[PDB]
Nucleic acid binder design. Structure first.
Ligand SMILES: [Mg+2]
Ligand SMILES: [Mg+2]
Ligand SMILES: [Mg+2]
Ligand SMILES: [Mg+2]
Ligand SMILES: [Mg+2]
Ligand SMILES: [Mg+2]
Ligand SMILES: [Mg+2]
Ligand SMILES: [Mg+2]
Ligand SMILES: [Mg+2]
Ligand SMILES: [Mg+2]
Ligand SMILES: [Mg+2]
Ligand SMILES: [Mg+2]
Ligand SMILES: [Mg+2]
Ligand SMILES: [Mg+2]
Ligand SMILES: [Mg+2]
Ligand SMILES: [Mg+2]
Ligand SMILES: [Mg+2]
Ligand SMILES: [Mg+2]
Ligand SMILES: [Mg+2]
Ligand SMILES: [Mg+2]
Ligand SMILES: [Mg+2]
Ligand SMILES: [Mg+2]
Ligand SMILES: [Mg+2]
Ligand SMILES: [Mg+2]
Ligand SMILES: [Mg+2]
Ligand SMILES: [Mg+2]
Ligand SMILES: [Mg+2]
Ligand SMILES: [Mg+2]
Ligand SMILES: [Mg+2]
Ligand SMILES: [Mg+2]
Ligand SMILES: [Mg+2]
Ligand SMILES: [Mg+2]
Ligand SMILES: [Mg+2]
Ligand SMILES: [Mg+2]
Ligand SMILES: [Mg+2]
Ligand SMILES: [Mg+2]
Ligand SMILES: [Mg+2]
Ligand SMILES: [Mg+2]
Ligand SMILES: [Mg+2]
Ligand SMILES: [Mg+2]
Ligand SMILES: [Mg+2]
Ligand SMILES: [Mg+2]
Ligand SMILES: [Mg+2]
Ligand SMILES: [Mg+2]
Ligand SMILES: [Mg+2]
Ligand SMILES: [Mg+2]
Ligand SMILES: [Mg+2]
Ligand SMILES: [Mg+2]
Ligand SMILES: [Mg+2]
Ligand SMILES: [Mg+2]
Ligand SMILES: [Mg+2]
Ligand SMILES: [Mg+2]
Ligand SMILES: [Mg+2]
Ligand SMILES: [Mg+2]
Ligand SMILES: [Mg+2]
Ligand SMILES: [Mg+2]
Ligand SMILES: [Mg+2]
Ligand SMILES: [Mg+2]
Ligand SMILES: [Mg+2]
Ligand SMILES: [Mg+2]
Ligand SMILES: [Mg+2]
Ligand SMILES: [Mg+2]
Ligand SMILES: [Mg+2]
Ligand SMILES: [Mg+2]
Ligand SMILES: [Mg+2]
Ligand SMILES: [Mg+2]
Ligand SMILES: [Mg+2]
Ligand SMILES: [Mg+2]
Ligand SMILES: [Mg+2]
Ligand SMILES: [Mg+2]
Ligand SMILES: [Mg+2]
Ligand SMILES: [Mg+2]
Ligand SMILES: [Mg+2]
Ligand SMILES: [Mg+2]
Ligand SMILES: [Mg+2]
Ligand SMILES: [Mg+2]
Ligand SMILES: [Mg+2]
Ligand SMILES: [Mg+2]
Ligand SMILES: [Mg+2]
Ligand SMILES: [Mg+2]
Ligand SMILES: [Mg+2]
Ligand SMILES: [Mg+2]
Ligand SMILES: [Mg+2]
Ligand SMILES: [Mg+2]
Ligand SMILES: [Mg+2]
Ligand SMILES: [Mg+2]
Ligand SMILES: [Mg+2]
Ligand SMILES: [Mg+2]
Ligand SMILES: [Mg+2]
Ligand SMILES: [Mg+2]
Ligand SMILES: [Mg+2]
Ligand SMILES: [Mg+2]
Ligand SMILES: [Mg+2]
Ligand SMILES: [Mg+2]
Ligand SMILES: [Mg+2]
Ligand SMILES: [Mg+2]
Ligand SMILES: [Mg+2]
Ligand SMILES: [Mg+2]
Ligand SMILES: [Mg+2]
Ligand SMILES: [Mg+2]
Ligand SMILES: [Mg+2]
Ligand SMILES: [Mg+2]
Ligand SMILES: [Mg+2]
Ligand SMILES: [Mg+2]
Ligand SMILES: [Mg+2]
Ligand SMILES: [Mg+2]
Ligand SMILES: [Mg+2]
Ligand SMILES: [Mg+2]
Ligand SMILES: [Mg+2]
Ligand SMILES: [Mg+2]
Ligand SMILES: [Mg+2]
Ligand SMILES: [Mg+2]
Ligand SMILES: [Mg+2]
Ligand SMILES: [Mg+2]
Ligand SMILES: [Mg+2]
Ligand SMILES: [Mg+2]
Ligand SMILES: [Mg+2]
Ligand SMILES: [Mg+2]
Ligand SMILES: [Mg+2]
Ligand SMILES: [Mg+2]
Ligand SMILES: [Mg+2]
Ligand SMILES: [Mg+2]
Ligand SMILES: [Mg+2]
Ligand SMILES: [Mg+2]
Ligand SMILES: [Mg+2]
Ligand SMILES: [Mg+2]
Ligand SMILES: [Mg+2]
Ligand SMILES: [Mg+2]
Ligand SMILES: [Mg+2]
Ligand SMILES: [Mg+2]
Ligand SMILES: [Mg+2]
Ligand SMILES: [Mg+2]
Ligand SMILES: [Mg+2]
Ligand SMILES: [Mg+2]
Ligand SMILES: [Mg+2]
Ligand SMILES: [Mg+2]
Ligand SMILES: [Mg+2]
Ligand SMILES: [Mg+2]
Ligand SMILES: [Mg+2]
Ligand SMILES: [Mg+2]
Ligand SMILES: [Mg+2]
Ligand SMILES: [Mg+2]
Ligand SMILES: [Mg+2]
Ligand SMILES: [Mg+2]
Ligand SMILES: [Mg+2]
Ligand SMILES: [Mg+2]
Ligand SMILES: [Mg+2]
Ligand SMILES: [Mg+2]
Ligand SMILES: [Mg+2]
Ligand SMILES: [Mg+2]
Ligand SMILES: [Mg+2]
Ligand SMILES: [Mg+2]
Ligand SMILES: [Mg+2]
Ligand SMILES: [Mg+2]
Ligand SMILES: [Mg+2]
Ligand SMILES: [Mg+2]
Ligand SMILES: [Mg+2]
Ligand SMILES: [Mg+2]
Ligand SMILES: [Mg+2]
Ligand SMILES: [Mg+2]
Ligand SMILES: [Mg+2]
Ligand SMILES: [Mg+2]
Length: 265
RNA sequence: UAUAUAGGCGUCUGGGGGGAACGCGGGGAAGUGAAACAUCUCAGUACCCGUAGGAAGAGAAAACAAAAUGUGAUUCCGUG
RNA sequence: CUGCUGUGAAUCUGCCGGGACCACCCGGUAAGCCUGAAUACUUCCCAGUGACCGAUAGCGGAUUAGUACCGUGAGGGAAU
RNA sequence: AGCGAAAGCGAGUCUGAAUAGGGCGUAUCCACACAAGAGUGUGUGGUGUAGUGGUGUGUUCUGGACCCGAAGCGGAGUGAUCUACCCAUGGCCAGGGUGAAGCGCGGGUAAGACCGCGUGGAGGCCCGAACCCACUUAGGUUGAAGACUGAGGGGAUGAGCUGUGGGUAGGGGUGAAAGGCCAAUCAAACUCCGUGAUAGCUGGUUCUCCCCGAAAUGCAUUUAGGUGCAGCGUCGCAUGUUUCUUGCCGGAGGUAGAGCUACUGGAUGGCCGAUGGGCCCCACAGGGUUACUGACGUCAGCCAAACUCCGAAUGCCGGU
RNA sequence: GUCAGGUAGAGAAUACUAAGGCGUACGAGUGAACUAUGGUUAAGGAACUCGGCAAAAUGCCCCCGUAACUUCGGGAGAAG
RNA sequence: AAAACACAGGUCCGUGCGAAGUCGCAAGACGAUGUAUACGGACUGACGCCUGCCCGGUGCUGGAAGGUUAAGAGGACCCGUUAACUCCCUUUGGGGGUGAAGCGGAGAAUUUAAGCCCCAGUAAACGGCGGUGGUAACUAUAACAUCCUAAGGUAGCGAAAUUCCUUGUCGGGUAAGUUCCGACCUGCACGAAUGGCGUAACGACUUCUCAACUGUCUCAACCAUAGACUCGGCGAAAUUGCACUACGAGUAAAGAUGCUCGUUACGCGCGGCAGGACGAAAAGACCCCGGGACCUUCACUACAACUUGGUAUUGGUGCUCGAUACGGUUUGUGUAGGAUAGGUGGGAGACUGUGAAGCUCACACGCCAGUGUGGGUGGAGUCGUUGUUGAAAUACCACUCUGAUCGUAUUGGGCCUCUAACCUCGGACCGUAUAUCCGGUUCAGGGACAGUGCCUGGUGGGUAGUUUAACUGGGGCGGUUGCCUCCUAAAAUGUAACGGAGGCGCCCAAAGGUUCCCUCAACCUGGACGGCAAUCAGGUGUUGAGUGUAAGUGCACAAGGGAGCUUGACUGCGAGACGGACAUGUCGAGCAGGGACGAAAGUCGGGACUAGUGAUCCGGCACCUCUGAGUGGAAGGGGUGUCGCUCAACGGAUAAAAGGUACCCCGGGGAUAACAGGCUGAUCUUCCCCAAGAGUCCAUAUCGACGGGAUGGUUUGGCACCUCGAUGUCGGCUCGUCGCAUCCUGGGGCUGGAGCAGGUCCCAAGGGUUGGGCUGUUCGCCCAUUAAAGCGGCACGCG
């Protein structure tokens, strides 16, 4: 009487039970074809468990999907440019750049070692013990970088900007990830931890865009993340830059903000 | 409804109810005892029902018995 | 031995019983019926008797006694 | 006449292979022998064996069984004249407010909506007597009354109140549901009967004197405030000092005390001095120096219900 | 269950009355405490107490005028 | 009298109609003279916005391929009895073996329903709704990776009729705010029809506030009436061992009118007060014990009800399959070969023109190697012990297993039917003037079903009877219950407690018997691994090692270590004893049989010893010379050996059993708890001894650490001494009374006392010692005062 998600994770189909739920969610893994009727299934281990046959499953976290979705809309070159990750410590975003042939990447954490052992062996992988959260060091990360990916959680991503515009070059290219129910004053999270309010997302994206513009970093374009938090955390990836023909800083910022939520998700 | 029956009309002869105990045939507890209790007991008791008679019921072997050339319908009493 | 249900024979070199059953022996003759005496009792009547009571006893009732009275009622129930 | 489970045998019998031990039985005593002192046996004689039926007393068994006492259980009946609900057929509800729909008029509306005005008489409507309740409080509390009285209190045309007649009955009825009510009683009414229910529980049990005279412990217990058997009382019979005391004699103990270099543990201070500690010359050889920690040992003083190299007094067993 | 005089009054309420009916079955005394039932109370006014319990207070008619809120009926006899 | 019930509104489930449901044994009735917009049941409870997740558990509903399962059909196989033989062995018998039929007993395979397992749906069904590892804005305000599930609280609300902590925090309100209001979220232990959150109107509901009003109060005074009181009349009651019934300090069953010692008191009444008479009342209702009673449930065991199947009532024809008896085709690879050699008895002689041979196909199989039947053709034969071939015809009559077959006789399983039993609360007509009864007749429908008997399996708190241990410093909760060893245990034996420590419910065919032989542990010295340590050698070493297994007593004489043989880990017994309420239990020399070891002496009836166990009943099994319901057998019983009980509550109430009662009742108990009293005083409380210190120095102005000794009886306790045929339980009110351990007032000594004001100690009990807010409050917090707002005893004084 072994749980179906139990046998699945035992075989090696998915390294974690959260992924076992993702696979049963669309019914990618079942016996005799068909969607897995229910995640509560008593299946004998002598049966056959299938899979979506995802060829590009060389990923070790969920942060991969949201990134590959952003890079679909942006198509940003990585080789030949230094890169910065604002802290994932789980291989969600940096490992994708590894698959992108990144020249050299740097990642942060909360002062904790929990990365995949696979990434503890690549020479171009730098690990730091949360030197600082908001005012990132522009030189101790190895010098100048040419890309920064924003991945923040229970901290309103609006205080690391002075550091991330300094932790860059004069010709910089940045893709921040705006999480809606996390920009509102801490404690004022949306109803039940999930937000169904386009106007709240509008307020959050406007606040982050205006905070970026305060430094001069204008918003170029928008993107809706394809695979969000399971219970609900739909993200909206923007794009920071100070010198392009797409200097949407006066009126086009709002037009692009409507685009973000009108085509989101 | 034809055979007819169910019925209807008339004329007789009975039945009905009571009763203290005793009889016969049925139905049938619980308290109690078992130092608890259910089998078991109490007890086929108490009570109930149907029926009598001066008594009733039983009664003339499809019985006993045990190798005895033995008893011989039933009922009741004493023993065993 | 016996009730309800099912199945269900023979008429005497038959059938029943003799403490599972079988053989032999013995006893008897079911599925029809009547039957006195010896046995149980006393509402009532007669005549007696008591190392029985003697009026708080003996019947509840020696006297208005199943009365007066109590209870809606089944019923309880004096004292003299 | 007994032994045996029995067939059976019989002063024997059972077990057993056993004239080989034991069991039960051969009244009891006496003697004389023949065998062993491992508790005496065996045998020859003798003596010869006591029951039963009336009846008094004590105890006991079956019966209500020394007397009184439950809450309750069963059988058959009686009750809805109180109360619960229902059914038929009747009666009652002073007085005063409010002002629903409906209808009619006007305004307003493409037409409506709607409003203002009237008539109108709705309603588990309002205030409030009769009537029905019973919220507060005081009195009553061997009452006026086994549930009232006074002052206020809620409903008062309604799921209203009420009269007369009727129906539902006990593991049943009825319940706008409180285990409420069902005749001053209800977690199963009442009456009679079973019946003198049963109570390891409480209570009571009536004249005298004479002699003797306890126990409140052990064991078992659906047991722990009950009982059985033992102990301990009395009476009858048998035996006769067997009892008890004191002296002496023969014993076995491990308590008091003590001791511990006699063990097992604890435990005080010294003494020498390791091994393992550090350092020198300089190797991690080797050697010595040093608060070293300081095994073992040793000196002296100690401690113990489950320690004992020892070890009484008493008590106990026997003899005399 | 029926009948329902007068005067105030909306009234079958309440006060007093008519007709009619009663004075209903222990009394007579008496300025004790205390209890009960009524009454009044300077100044203060809930300080009482578990709590404004109980008392006190408002109370009728006619004009004027009425709030938040509302389910548009009400609240409302608001309050004044 | 309520917030509880009801309610209008909501949903869910059942019900197709003499419905379902209910009352009845039935008939019958209500439902309803209703018919799914109706009726019953369940929950919720106008209205408004909504009602999340979980179908794993348990129910409900549905389904069926399998597993399992009753009665009923089946009777293979076995056993009893004995007609017959067949034999001895002795002779007129009598035991051995076989044993047909018949009758009997136990009875297997096989077949068969529901249910259960199984798989689905269902939550406005009964029910459920998580964490961890390390984190940033200025700490936060749980929404980075991973474990687990049936899913991980949705919305809304939230110190709540819900919050112990708690008088949470902040604001309001008061002079003073434990209640209240508005919020906060750390929701011990809210949450979505046991609805969640709001809501106008309503309430003899609960709570907070303001105005007004007042004898509620400061703080009480006065008046009248009914009693009380006096006089006359009548005239009770509960109660009651007494009696010419003081107090104090004691003593006593521990709280005395009655006893002690002292003090006080002339005799008798009337009106008043309630301190005592553990006052009256009611065989304590709290608590324990015994017994009831009613209630609950997956306690036990039953029964109603519901339901399954078989069979009776109960029949007919058609098919489909199965079992029987009977008939005719039809079958057998083999090598020594004219052989696709069914097992045969007869076999010198059977088969043609009723057209066989050889040709045409099918039937039959085919390991397709080859052969039997028909007519269409066909022409007048083929065959044998032929010889090889175990077995010959494969030329013929009668018996025949293997098979592919049809039919008859018989009997089942099923299926579609028919009508004739039976059924209809469908119509009509009649008895019958009257009649929704009833019976009949007849038409129309079902129909061998249903219903009902009997047998049978399920479900079965719907009901019924009952059980649900004891010990216990009250009871409960915990723990324990039998056996063995030690200490307590006081030098015999025995000895209690919920006293102090541990073991047991086995193990070993050798770890049993015998015969013989040996001596360890530790220490020093010498040796490659090899270290203190492993095996070797030398020595010292009397017991410190080891003895299956706890502990104790033992054992070096060895009971300890080693080897040989071997089963005495025997059968018949047992003088005499230990221990003992009894029932149990324990030791035992010696005799005989038959053995083991030993030369023999001798030892051996398990183990160095003391745990390793369960009475009786009832039943099983093997053996025996017992019995055998007329007789012979048998069945059944009996003896002997043995088997089956965490009966572990271990002397074992049943084969079989849990809980609630605050709705409770009875019988008892001060044998036993709660209150008060009594004893004690661990704790509590109040003092003291010593003085390391602190105080700049200076123990002792003032505090005094570490330790030590006491008082009181106010606290929490310990005990269980009186009271359970009744000793009323907190706080406040009224009224006191006593102590002093003094709060104020009065008198002082020392000061680290200049004065003012204090600190500490000593003496002193005459008087005094406030009113409020918060709270049920005591306690306590606060407000305004005051000379001060003392602490205690008196049944935590006083109903
Ligand atoms: Mg008669
Ligand atoms: Mg009985
Ligand atoms: Mg009994
Ligand atoms: Mg009894
Ligand atoms: Mg006669
Ligand atoms: Mg006769
Ligand atoms: Mg006769
Ligand atoms: Mg008399
Ligand atoms: Mg006289
Ligand atoms: Mg009399
Ligand atoms: Mg009368
Ligand atoms: Mg005998
Ligand atoms: Mg024997
Ligand atoms: Mg003898
Ligand atoms: Mg005589
Ligand atoms: Mg005699
Ligand atoms: Mg009765
Ligand atoms: Mg009646
Ligand atoms: Mg009108
Ligand atoms: Mg109108
Ligand atoms: Mg009204
Ligand atoms: Mg009203
Ligand atoms: Mg009114
Ligand atoms: Mg009024
Ligand atoms: Mg009124
Ligand atoms: Mg009432
Ligand atoms: Mg009240
Ligand atoms: Mg009085
Ligand atoms: Mg009076
Ligand atoms: Mg009143
Ligand atoms: Mg009144
Ligand atoms: Mg009426
Ligand atoms: Mg009547
Ligand atoms: Mg009732
Ligand atoms: Mg009566
Ligand atoms: Mg009554
Ligand atoms: Mg009853
Ligand atoms: Mg009863
Ligand atoms: Mg009796
Ligand atoms: Mg009695
Ligand atoms: Mg004497
Ligand atoms: Mg005795
Ligand atoms: Mg005696
Ligand atoms: Mg002597
Ligand atoms: Mg001596
Ligand atoms: Mg000695
Ligand atoms: Mg000793
Ligand atoms: Mg000593
Ligand atoms: Mg020791
Ligand atoms: Mg000692
Ligand atoms: Mg008038
Ligand atoms: Mg009047
Ligand atoms: Mg007059
Ligand atoms: Mg006077
Ligand atoms: Mg007054
Ligand atoms: Mg005044
Ligand atoms: Mg005034
Ligand atoms: Mg006020
Ligand atoms: Mg106050
Ligand atoms: Mg106040
Ligand atoms: Mg006060
Ligand atoms: Mg009042
Ligand atoms: Mg008034
Ligand atoms: Mg107004
Ligand atoms: Mg208002
Ligand atoms: Mg007004
Ligand atoms: Mg009310
Ligand atoms: Mg009341
Ligand atoms: Mg209620
Ligand atoms: Mg409804
Ligand atoms: Mg439901
Ligand atoms: Mg029905
Ligand atoms: Mg429906
Ligand atoms: Mg409700
Ligand atoms: Mg609702
Ligand atoms: Mg729900
Ligand atoms: Mg669910
Ligand atoms: Mg579920
Ligand atoms: Mg389910
Ligand atoms: Mg399911
Ligand atoms: Mg089912
Ligand atoms: Mg059968
Ligand atoms: Mg809260
Ligand atoms: Mg509150
Ligand atoms: Mg709560
Ligand atoms: Mg609080
Ligand atoms: Mg506050
Ligand atoms: Mg609040
Ligand atoms: Mg519910
Ligand atoms: Mg709840
Ligand atoms: Mg719910
Ligand atoms: Mg509600
Ligand atoms: Mg609320
Ligand atoms: Mg409200
Ligand atoms: Mg009301
Ligand atoms: Mg009320
Ligand atoms: Mg005064
Ligand atoms: Mg007077
Ligand atoms: Mg007088
Ligand atoms: Mg005194
Ligand atoms: Mg005293
Ligand atoms: Mg005295
Ligand atoms: Mg005297
Ligand atoms: Mg007096
Ligand atoms: Mg008095
Ligand atoms: Mg008085
Ligand atoms: Mg009393
Ligand atoms: Mg009592
Ligand atoms: Mg009890
Ligand atoms: Mg049938
Ligand atoms: Mg049937
Ligand atoms: Mg049941
Ligand atoms: Mg029951
Ligand atoms: Mg009984
Ligand atoms: Mg008991
Ligand atoms: Mg007990
Ligand atoms: Mg205790
Ligand atoms: Mg105690
Ligand atoms: Mg001793
Ligand atoms: Mg001694
Ligand atoms: Mg003792
Ligand atoms: Mg143990
Ligand atoms: Mg040995
Ligand atoms: Mg041996
Ligand atoms: Mg050696
Ligand atoms: Mg040995
Ligand atoms: Mg043995
Ligand atoms: Mg003996
Ligand atoms: Mg021998
Ligand atoms: Mg021997
Ligand atoms: Mg027995
Ligand atoms: Mg016989
Ligand atoms: Mg015989
Ligand atoms: Mg036998
Ligand atoms: Mg026991
Ligand atoms: Mg026992
Ligand atoms: Mg038993
Ligand atoms: Mg209740
Ligand atoms: Mg009682
Ligand atoms: Mg006592
Ligand atoms: Mg007291
Ligand atoms: Mg006490
Ligand atoms: Mg006392
Ligand atoms: Mg100083
Ligand atoms: Mg005692
Ligand atoms: Mg006493
Ligand atoms: Mg008491
Ligand atoms: Mg008394
Ligand atoms: Mg009293
Ligand atoms: Mg008394
Ligand atoms: Mg006082
Ligand atoms: Mg003093
Ligand atoms: Mg003082
Ligand atoms: Mg002074
Ligand atoms: Mg001074
Ligand atoms: Mg003076
Ligand atoms: Mg308060
Ligand atoms: Mg005082
Ligand atoms: Mg007190
Ligand atoms: Mg006091
Ligand atoms: Mg009191
Ligand atoms: Mg009182």
């Amino acid at each position: 009487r072994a749980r179906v998600d139990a046998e699945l994770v035992r075989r090696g189909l998915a390294r974690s039970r959260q992924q076992a739920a993702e696979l049963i969610g669309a019914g990618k893994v079942r016996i005799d074809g068909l969607p897995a009727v229910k995640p509560a299934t008593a299946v004998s281990d002598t049966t056959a468990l299938t899979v979506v046959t995802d060829s590009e499953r060389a990923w070790v976290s969920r942060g991969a999907h949201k990134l590959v979705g952003a890079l679909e809309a942006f198509a940003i070159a990585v080789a030949g440019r230094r890169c910065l990750d604002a802290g994932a410590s789980t291989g969600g975003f940096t490992e994708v750049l590894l698959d992108r042939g990144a020249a050299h990447v740097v990642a942060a954490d909360v002062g904790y070692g929990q990365l995949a052992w696979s990434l503890r062996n690549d020479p171009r992988v730098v690990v730091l013990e949360r030197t600082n959260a908001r005012g990132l060091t522009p030189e101790a990360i190895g010098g100048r970088v040419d890309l920064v990916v924003a991945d923040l959680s229970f901290i309103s991503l609006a205080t690391v900007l002075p550091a991330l515009v300094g932790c860059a070059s004069r010709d910089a290219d940045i893709v921040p990830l705006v999480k809606p129910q996390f920009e509102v004053g801490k404690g004022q999270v949306g109803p039940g931890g999930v937000v169904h309010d386009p106007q709240l997302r509008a307020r959050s994206v406007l606040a982050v865009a205006r905070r970026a513009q305060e430094l001069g970093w204008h918003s170029v374009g928008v993107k809706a993340s394809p695979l969000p938090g399971p219970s609900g955390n739909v993200e909206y990836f923007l794009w920071l830059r100070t010198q392009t023909d797409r200097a949407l800083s006066a009126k086009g910022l709002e037009d692009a903000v409507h685009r973000a939520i009108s085509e989101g998700p």
